[model samples]
Target chain A: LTQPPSVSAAPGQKVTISCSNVFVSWYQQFPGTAPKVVIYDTDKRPSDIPDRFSGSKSGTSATLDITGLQTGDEADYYCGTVFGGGTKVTVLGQPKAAPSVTLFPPSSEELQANKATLVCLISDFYPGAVTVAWKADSSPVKAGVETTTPSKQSNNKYAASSYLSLTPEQWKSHKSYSCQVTHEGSTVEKTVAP
Target chain B: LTQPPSVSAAPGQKVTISCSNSWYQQFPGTAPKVVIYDTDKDRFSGSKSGTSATLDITGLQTGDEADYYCGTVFGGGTKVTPKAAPSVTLFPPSSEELQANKATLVCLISDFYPGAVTVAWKADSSPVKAGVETTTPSKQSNNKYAASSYLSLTPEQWKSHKSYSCQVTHEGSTVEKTVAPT
Candidate 1:
C-alpha cells in the first residue's frame, strides 16, 4: 500500500518517520545533473557529506533523523514503500502555514522589583484577520499590551510581535498573565509569571 | 512562574497562531514594513533565507505556538504572514587538513534516531584512521531521539585531498555521503 510519510509526537515528544518495504536513498535534484546518490541503503553518507544527518534500519524499516526540530524542520519528506505491484513512493507532510511563538531574553526569571516585559510573537497565520489580547485574573487586560501588522518573510509567510509590560507589584498580586492569540476559528492562550 | 508557550495541543498535533495584537507595531530585526495588529491576527505567510527562515517572535510566551506560517490583514487586505520554513540549518559532514595536534576535525549530529546507523571518517578513497563511534541520543521534548559524533585526524592525512565521509548503514545496504564548507 502507498501512503504519505506520517509524523506524530506529543508536545515536547520525539517524532519518527517510518518507511516500509522500500530502502532509503538521497538524490540531489540539481538543474541538469542527474539526481546523484548522496545517501543509499539508509544511513550511509556520501563521500562529501559530514555525519550530522544519519540513516539507519531496524528490521524492515529505514529511518532518517533531522534533529533539534525548529519551525523550519517542516519539509517535503518522501518515502518509498512496497505495494503489491512495484515500489510505491509517497511524499511526506505538506509544508503548511504553522503558527510559531517566541520569547525575548529567553530566561524565565523575573526580579521582584524589576519591570517585566513579556512579548507574544506569532507567525505563519492564515485567513488574515485575528485578534490578540492579554488577560490577568482571567479578565481582559487593556493596558501596556500592544501588537503590530504582520511582516513579510522571504517565503511569503506573515509574522507579528506583541508586548505587555507589568511592574513587580502588578505581577506579585496577579496569578499569571495570558497572551490570548486568536485566529480564524481557533484560539490559543499562553500564560506567564514573574 | 514562567512556562513555555502552551501551544494548546499534545505533541504531534497541528496548531495555529493569531498574529493580531492591540496596536500595530513593527517587529524588531525583521525585513518588510508589516506590523502586527488585531485585525491581521488570523492571516499567515512564510519566508526563506538560504534554506531557512528566522521566525522572530520578539515578545513570546510559554503558551504560544512555535510553528511557521503566513497570513494577511483583516481590513487592509494585505498578505501578512508568508508561507515558508522557519529558521533551520542542515549540516553536512566535513573534512580538514590534519595538523600536529593543532588542527582537528569534529563531526556532530544534534538529533537522534532509533534503529542502526554508522558514522565514519575516511581519508582519501580508503578508510584511513578511526572506525566509528556512537553515543547515547539525548531526549528532548516529546521523547524524541537526539545524538552526535566526531572524528579526529592528523594534518598529514588531510593535505593529500584525503576526503572524509559519514556513512549511514541500514538493512545491509549503505548510504555514504559528505559535505564541505559553504
Candidate 2:
C-alpha cells in the first residue's frame, strides 16, 4: 500500500485517503486508543459508521473519503490488505512542520579540558513540543543529557537545543553517536563521530 | 486469535507456512513428498532466515489442507497441518440391556477435515477411562470424516450417576454433549 506520510484539512473540510489494493481495509486510531474499523473489503462500511465516511474502489486502487469533517475525525488512518503490510495516514487539524535536526561535535576547547560535549540544534518546528534523546552506537545515553524548552522564533516557528556531556574516554570508546529529535510523533536523527 | 498454530483461507488466496527452523507436504495416510526442498518451485516459494524456513503459497486451493513438515532433508521433521473442527452428538444407551447389568453410550463426531480427534467420556463430571472404545475416522460422502466412540457402563453405575457426557477435541477446540436422566 502507498500513501503520503500525513495529510491535513480544517474541521469543516473534507479529506480522501487512498491506497493500492488487493483487498483494501481502513482503520482509524486516536492517540493512546485502539483502532476502529472504517472500511473493509475495499469499499464497505459498518452500519454504525456515519454516511459521511465513505469508501470506493476503481481498478486497482481504493479510496476512503470523509465529508463534513469534525474535530473528532483528526486521527491516524491506516490502509492494509491481506498479503501486504500497511501504510499510515496522519490527519492534521492544521499543517505542522517537522523539525530539522543538526548535531554539532564537541569543540577543541572542551577536548583540551579532557571532556566532550555534543549539541543537537532543533529548528523550524511548530507547536513547541519535541523530545530529544542521545544514543551511543545504538545504545541510549541518559545520564548526562539535558534539553532546553522551546523558544519561539521570528518566523513564529519553534527552536530548541539538547546537550550531551561525555567523558573523553567514553567518547573515544564509541564509534558513533546520534541525536534523535521527536516532533509530532515522528523522529529524526543525526549522527556524529570523533 | 488466528496466530500460528493453525490458519485457513479461501481458494486462490495467499498463505504462509513456517517450518521454524526446506518444506514438504504430506496428506493423511501417506509419506511427505518433496514439494519445496532447498527452496523454489513454480507456484511455491521458500526462504530461510536464521532458525526458521518459510514457504509461501501464492494461490491456495482445495487439497492444499495437508500436513507439512520441515527439516534439513526429511524423516526427522517437525509438522503442522491445516485443520477443521468437528461437531459432536451423544446418543443414549439402547434399551436392549447388553447384559442385564450393562449399557453402552455412543459419541458421534462428524464433518471434520484432516482426520484427527480425541474423545473422552465423563460421568458426574469426572473422567471415565475403562470400557471405552473408539473407531478410526471414516470418510463420508462430503469427503469429510466421522468417528464414533462407545462407553460401556453397568446399569447400577448409569442409574446412580447424576450425569454423563462425551467430549471431543478437534483442531485445538473442545466440543461436548451431556446426558442427564431424561
Candidate 3:
C-alpha cells in the first residue's frame, strides 16, 4: 500500500521498479489524463504500448522496464493499487524539477545535401509520460519525421526526445522547424535552425 | 507499417515486446493503449463467463518489464488491448488446454451473491486474465444451474495441473461447485 522508493539511472543505463499489491487493486495513472493499464498480474501491457517498454512477473512482484536513455528523459513515475472502492496512487521521482526544452546541435551549422538530424530534448518531468511533435513554417510536419519516448534516466527523473531529419534546403529555409513537448505537467518548446 | 506477430508464454514464464516507429512524425493510428496495469487490471464476473478465473503472480522482471500477449478468442475471456471495430481484440490467454494425467478440479457456489460474486484461486478471489484457466457461463434447463462459471490453463499447466477449486458464493446460502480439466 506504500509507494516504492524513487529510481535513478544514467543516460544509457536501464532502470526498474517493483510494484506490489498488499491491500488494494492496482491501476496506472499517467499525468494529465486518467491512469491506464501498464502491468496486470505482474507482467502485461495492454495492446497500446510499444515493446520498448515492458513488464514481467516473478512471484508477487511486477517489474517495468525502459530501454535506451537520453538527456530530456526525466519525469515522475507512479505505481498505484486500487481496492475496496478507493485507490492508492504513489508518485515516484523528483518533486520540484521544472520542465524545460533544449535544442541539440546549437546553431550556425552547415548541412550536406538534403540530410540533417535535429533533436528536441525535454527534461525535469513528473508523471513520466508526454507527447512531442514537429512543425515547419507553423504547419505540422509531414507524417514521416518524428519519434518520441518517455524514457527513464539515472536520478528518478524522466525524459522524452524527438528526432527529425530533412534535406539541407528544407532545413535552411524552414523557419518553422520546431519541437513541441507536451505533458499533463507542463508544456515547452525549442526552435531549430534559427 | 506492419502489424507485429502474436505472443504466447507459460503460466510462470516471463515475456516482453518492443514497439518502434518506422518513419516518425505524429503518425495517427499509432498511439498505444495501457493494457495490464498494476495487478489484475479490471476483470469482473458474471453469468456471461461460464467459468471462474483468477490472476496469479509469484514474481516480476527487471528492465523495462512490460509484457503483453496478443491473440483472438470466442465466447468469454479478458481483453488485453483497446477494442477496435471489426478487429479481434487481444486477450490474455487465447487458449487453455489441460494435459493428461493432471489433477481433477471443480468449481463451487453456495449462494447467489448477485453483483458481489467473486471466484478465487487460493483464497485471494482476484479475477485472473480472461480465457486462460477460466470459463464462460452456462445455462441449465429449468431451475438447476441458472448462473455459469468457467476454467482454463496453459497447455503445460494442463499437463501438470493439480488440485484447483472454483468457489462461488451468492445470495447468502446459495453456493456452487464444479471440477476442472477433466
Candidate 4:
C-alpha cells in the first residue's frame, strides 16, 4: 500500500492498489483512451476480466491484486471507493537501463535532399517519458531538428531515434553535435565532434 | 437514461422508464431513480440489475408524466454528472398570515427525474414522522413525477419557536428547505 510515484513488478508477481471495502472499484487507463472498469463491488470480476486479477478488502484497506503480470497489463491503474485516490502501477519487464545513442551521417555530405542529416538512436529506457535534446556547441539547436516520439517496446522499455537535418554547410561548420537523453535515475549523451 | 418521449397510458395501463449506468461510478458519481408520483395508490414497480435499472407504473393517472434519472459518480465522490433531473419544490405554507390553529406543509416534489425521491420533515434537529407522511409520487403531462406530502400541525406546534425543514433525496444528492415560524 505504498502509494508509489511509479512501480515495477516482475512477471508472475502481484501488486495491489490501496482502497477500502466501501464500494471500491478498479480501472485501467491507457494514455489518450477511455478507462475500462475491471473490478467492482469489492471483488466481483467483469465478464472478461482475467483470472490473474483478484480483489479483496480487509479491516480498513482494499487491494486490487494482480497476479502473473504481463507486458500487455502494463498500464496506469487507479483505485477508488466511497472515498478516492489514484496510484499509477507500472508492471516491470525491462531493467532500468539508460538510452543507447548513435549518430549516423546522411547518404552524402552534399545534402542530397538539400539537407544533410544526422540520426541519433536513443534506446532501452524504462518508465517512458524520457527527455531528448539536440545541442550544438554550448547552446541548443532549435532548427532543422526532428526528435522521434518515444515508443514502448515489447520488453516494456522505450526507444526513440531522432534525426537532425541541416544544410551541408552547417554540418561542416558546427563545432559540436550531441544527442542527449535523460530519464529517471540516469542521463546519457552521445556527442559527434566536428 | 432514456425517458420515453410520449406516454398515453390510461388508468390501469402500464408505463416504464429505464436508467442505464454510463460507467464512471468511481468518479463523477452514478445512481438513478424511478417512480410514478401521486397518492398512496399501489401502482408502482422497480428493479435493478448490474448497471441497468428500471421503474414502471400501472394504472396511469390522468396526464401522467413521471420522471426517471440516470446519474453517474466520477472523480471520486465529489463529482456527479446527472444525466437527467427535473425539479422538486416544496410549496409554502397555505397561508402567509400565520394562522396557528392548523398548519399544512406541502412538499411539491416535481420537475425532477427519477420519479423516486424521499422527502422528510425535521423539527429543528429532531426528526418528525408520526403526523408527517408523503403520497406515493404521481405525474404531470410533461413526463415528470410530481408528488407531495403533508405534515399536520397544531397552532401550538407551529408557533413553538421551532422550524420545520423539508429535505428531498434524489439520485445521490439531497436538497433541503426550511419553513420558519413567521
Candidate 5:
C-alpha cells in the first residue's frame, strides 16, 4: 500500500518499476473523486489509458512499462490490490504546457434564448486534468457549467471545452465575467466584459 | 512531402510529433524506415492515415527528442512521421467489488484516429452474445477518437474462471487482455 514518492524519467524514455508481492493494477486520481483504474489484472490494460503504458509481472514483482512519456504522465500513481500504495512520478523536462483560453461570445440569438451560453475552449495544454471555474466580476460562480475532460490532441497536447450558461437577465446584469483554468497549481483566468 | 525538423519531449513523457504530406525519394539500395530510425528503443506507437502519420514517443529520453526524418532514406522503407493513436486501457473489478457479486468490466479505447474499432468479450473462452456490451466511440476536441465498452455481468460470472479476455480489434491487429482469478 506504499510506494516511493518520486522517480525521475526522461520523457519518451522507457522506465519500469516493479511493485512487490501483489497482483497489480494502476490508477490515477485527483482529490475528492474515486480514482480511475488505468491497468488491471496485470497486462490487461484498457485502451483508454495511453497506448504508451503497458504492464507485465514476473512471479512476485509487477513491472509497468511506460513509453513515450509526456508532461501529463508526471503524476501520483497508485499500485492496485493488496498493495494499495501510490508512487510519485516526475517526468523530467516535459513541457507542462498550459491551456490557451478563449471565450466565444454568445450570439444575439443565443442570448435571446433566455440563456447566455458561454463556451470556454481550453486548448493546447498538456493531456491532463484542468479545472475550469466561473467568476462573475471576481465572485466565484458555480453550477450551470459543463466541462469536458482533457483530451489527447494529435500533437500529444490536450484540449477541452467548458460551457457556462446563465439566464439572460443574469447575463445582462453582469458587467464582466471570467473563465479560469487552474492547472498544475497555476491559475490562468481570462476576462470578458459585457 | 514536408516534415518538421525536430520535436522535444520530457522523460517519462508521451509525445507525438505530427507529420504529414509524406512522399518518398527513392534511391537504389535505400529506404527510409520510420520504425526505429534513431528512435528510443521500445518507445514507438503511431497512427497513420491519408498522407499524415504521427510518431508517438513514450518514456521520453533526451535521445527521443531529436530530429526524426521522413522520405526515402539510406536504408529502410517505411517513413516514421506519427499517428494520433488510441490510448487503450482495461479496468477490472477490485477484490472487494468482485466478492460483492456486482462488478462490471470496462474497456476504454481513446486517443486513436480513424475511430472505428471492435470490442469483443469472452468469458471462460466463450464468446459473449451481442447487446451484452456497450460501445461509446466518439470524437474528442482534437479530432482523435475515444470510446468505451462496458460488460454488465455479475462478479460471480467473472470469477467463475481463470481465462477471461477482452479482445480488441483496432485498424486491423488484435489485442487481448486475459484475467486470471487466482
Candidate 6:
C-alpha cells in the first residue's frame, strides 16, 4: 500500500488520505501500540470510533477521510491487506514541541559510595508521546535503565525522566553518556561526561 | 476445501463453522459472495488454525441463514450447508386430553432432515423417564422430516415442575424448546 509520507490539516478542517485493498481496511496507531481498526470492509466503523472518520473504496484504491479533525486525531495511519509502516497525519496549527533534554552526571556522594546514577530530564513537549534511549559513547545501554511515563505540566506540556544506574567503575570507564529522546519525528540528544 | 454437509444452531447463539480453507456465502439461485478473503468483511470474523479455517458467526439471526463454502486457487470445493433447524413446539397437557388427574405433553418437531433424530424429555434439565413415548422420523412431503414425542406426567408433577423441556437431537446438533405453567 502507498500513501503520502505525511499530511497536515488544521483542527476542524477536513483531510483525506488515500491508500493504494480491493478488500481494504484502515487502522490508526497512537505511536507505541498496535493499530486499532477505524474502518473495515471499506466503510464500516468499529463501534468505538467517532463518526467523523470515514472510509471508501472505488475499484482498487481506498480513501480515509477525517472530517472536523482534532488534535488527538494526529496519529500514524495504516492501510492494509497487514501493509507495512504507514503514513503520518499531522494536525496543523497544533505545533509539535521538541522536548528540552538535559543529562545529569553522577553525584560526587553517590560515586564515593561505589554506586553511580545518571539522570535525563525531558520537559515542555506537546503531543506527549516520546521514546527514550541511553547510550554509552556510541553503544546503547540496555540494562539498568528506567524511565517514567510522561506527566503533564501546568502549561499543558509534558515532562518525563529517565535514570541509568551503574557501578562507579563502569561510570569511570565510560567517556560520555548520552540521553536521546525521540518526539514527533525528531530525535533530541543531551550528552554529559563522566 | 471441506466442511460439514450441514450444521445447525439456534438464534442469538454464536457458532463457529469450520472449513478446510477464503470463504464465501451463497444462497440458492444466487451467486457466491465473499465474506472473508483472509478477513475482509463484517458480520463474520475469520481465522486460520493449522490447516483449517473457521468463521465465527456471533448473535446469529434468521437472516444469517445461508450456505457457506471455502475455496482456494488450487480448486476443488466442499459445501458448507447450514441447514434450517427444526421448530420444536411443546404443547402442554390440558386436563381431560388424556385421563383425569393425569396429563400428556406433546412435542412437535418439524422441518428437519437426513431423517435421523432422537427426543428426550427433561424437567428443569433433569431427565424424565417411565412415561415418555417418542416416534420415528416421518418423511414430510417437502422432503424434510417431522416427529412427535409424548410425555405422560401426573397433574401434580405438571403443576409442581418449574419448566418442562423437549430436547430434539438431529444429525449432530440439539435444540430445546421449553414451556412453563401460567
Model 2 Cα lDDT, one tens digit per residue, A15-104: 887666446767675543334568877778888788888888887877789887776776667665521223333334435889867566
Off by over 4 Å in 4: A1-7, A11-28, A35-73, A76-89, A110-113, A124-129, A142-144, A150-158, B1-182
**Model 6 over residues B1-182: C-alpha lDDT tens digits?**
56665677777787676766476664422334567786555567887778887777777775555667665521233333236578565656543333456566666566675766788889998998756655555444344555556666778788898999989888789999787765
lDDT by residue (tens digit), candidate 5, A22-123:
657776543322245578788888776778888787877777777887767766566755334455455655477778665554545446456466666666
- The candidate with the higher TM-score, 4 or 6, is 6
Q: How accurate is candidate 5 locally (lDDT)?
A: 0.58
Using alpha carbons, what is the TM-score of model 4?
Answer: 0.33
DockQ of every candidate: 0.02, 0.01, 0.01, 0.01, 0.01, 0.01
Tell me the alpha-carbon RMSD of every candidate: 24.2, 27.4, 27.4, 32.1, 25.6, 27.5
What would the per-residue lDDT of candidate 5 be over residues B106-161, giving only the tens digit for each residue?
Answer: 55565577768887888778888532443435555444666555555676666776
lDDT of each: 0.40, 0.66, 0.38, 0.56, 0.58, 0.68
Worst 10 residues of 3 chain B by lDDT: B82-91
**For all candidates listed, what's the TM-score of chain B alone?**
0.36, 0.54, 0.26, 0.50, 0.48, 0.52
* Candidate 4 chain B worst ten-residue window by lDDT: B73-82
Q: Write the per-residue lDDT of candidate 3 for residues A89-164, one digit (tens) a residue.
A: 2233236454455554322222523345555545556655556777887788845344433434444555544555
lDDT for predicted candidate 4 compared with the true structure: 0.56
Please give the range of 10 consecutive residues that has the lowest summed lDDT in model 5 chain B.
Answer: B23-32
lDDT of 1 by residue, B1-182 (tens): 11122234433333333332121221211111233322233233222245222223433332222322222211111111211111111122222122123223333332233423455555555664452333333332322233333343444444445355655443355545553332
- Model 2, CA-based lDDT: 0.66
State every prediction's TM-score relative to the real structure.
0.26, 0.33, 0.32, 0.33, 0.34, 0.40
* lDDT-superior candidate, 1 or 3: 1
Fnat, model 4, is 0.00
Q: Alpha carbon lDDT of residue A63, candidate 1?
A: 61
- lDDT, model 3, position B80: 18
